[PDB]
């Protein structure tokens, strides 16, 4: 996202406003205002590593924008927006992630490598790999008889079509000692 | 649901795995460590686009 | 299949470690374990 102080009305703020969001989802319900729209209106912009050097990025927007002129115990502990010098906003932190990783649920609650495993193991899982599976003559393939979408999901799963072509089943699970088997 | 982006060569689907490399035409200075007659070096790997 | 089409190889002073610059471009987590650890990255 692009940030400018560009506001007679108050402080520093993202070019993108809730109006564009309306205009965006207008075109979503129609399944005019594309991504390329945001990109030529200059509300949003491409940044490589080199250019990244010379900017300052807000994590969340809303949270990291208006100052201050009680707090949730259970929640994590976020720093702040003490800076006024913002140039850009992160669209959403969860996109620092890759495909495989974007299936791991609550991965921000795991020992760092427990993620690195599952983001390799899921590539050895089983399910519906393409809907034309019946007509393909691949040398080796496995399909799950009754795949289920997962009960716990990622917003990013939406784009990976994971709900529409899953990898497992929701098993009623007990964590218990039993027969020692 | 197929996303494409692959090739079909003799039946089997091939993917071209992206290759990483140092960018060229770029100026970089490095310290050449202890045993060297040289102490610092400025390289540029230069090439026609 | 997806994750295979967002895959990067990096042949051959310290390539394997997760660099700061890799923020937002490469997955911090999705790498092979072993001979190609951190050498095969995923976008």
């Amino acid at each position: 996202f692009i940030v400018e102080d560009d506001e007679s009305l108050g402080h520093k703020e993202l070019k993108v406003r809730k109006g564009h969001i309306a205009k965006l989802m207008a075109t979503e319900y129609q399944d005019e205002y594309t991504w390329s729209s945001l990109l030529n209106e200059g509300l949003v912009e491409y940044i490589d590593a080199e250019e990244e050097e010379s900017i300052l990025i807000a994590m969340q927007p809303e949270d990291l924008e208006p100052a201050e002129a009680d707090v949730d115990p259970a929640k994590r502990i976020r720093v702040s927006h003490h800076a006024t010098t913002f140039t850009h906003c992160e669209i959403h932190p969860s996109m620092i992630l890759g495909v495989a990783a974007s299936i791991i649920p609550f991965p921000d609650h795991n020992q760092s490598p427990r993620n690195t495993y599952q983001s390799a193991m899921g590539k050895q899982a089983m399910g519906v790999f393409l809907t034309n599976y019946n007509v393909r003559m691949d040398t080796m393939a496995n399909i799950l008889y009754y795949p289920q979408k997962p009960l716990g999901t990622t917003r990013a799963m939406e784009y990976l079509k994971f709900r529409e072509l899953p990898a497992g089943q929701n098993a009623i699970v007990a964590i218990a000692c039993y027969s020692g088997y | 649901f197929d996303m494409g982006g692959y090739f079909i060569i003799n039946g089997s689907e091939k993917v071209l795995i992206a290759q990483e490399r140092s960018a060229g035409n770029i100026v970089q200075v490095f310290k050449k460590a202890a045993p060297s007659p040289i102490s610092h070096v400025a390289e540029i790997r230069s090439a026609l686009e | 299949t997806l994750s295979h089409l967002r895959r990067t190889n990096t042949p051959i002073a310290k390539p394997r470690q997760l660099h700061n610059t890799h923020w937002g471009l490469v997955c911090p987590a999705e790498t092979p374990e072993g001979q190609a650890c951190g050498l095969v990255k995923n976008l």
Binding site: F1, R17, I21, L24, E28, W35, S36, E158, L160 | - | -
Partner: peptide, 30 residues
């Protein structure tokens, strides 16, 4: 108020339209 500040949940809408355009294999194609 079509020029209001944008909330966190709103970013997804943008992210949605990103993939409408590029899809998951943007790079390989382009």
């Amino acid at each position: 108020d079509e020029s209001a500040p944008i909330t966190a949940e709103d970013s997804w809408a943008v992210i949605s339209a990103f993939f409408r355009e590029k899809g998951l294999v943007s790079q390989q194609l382009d």
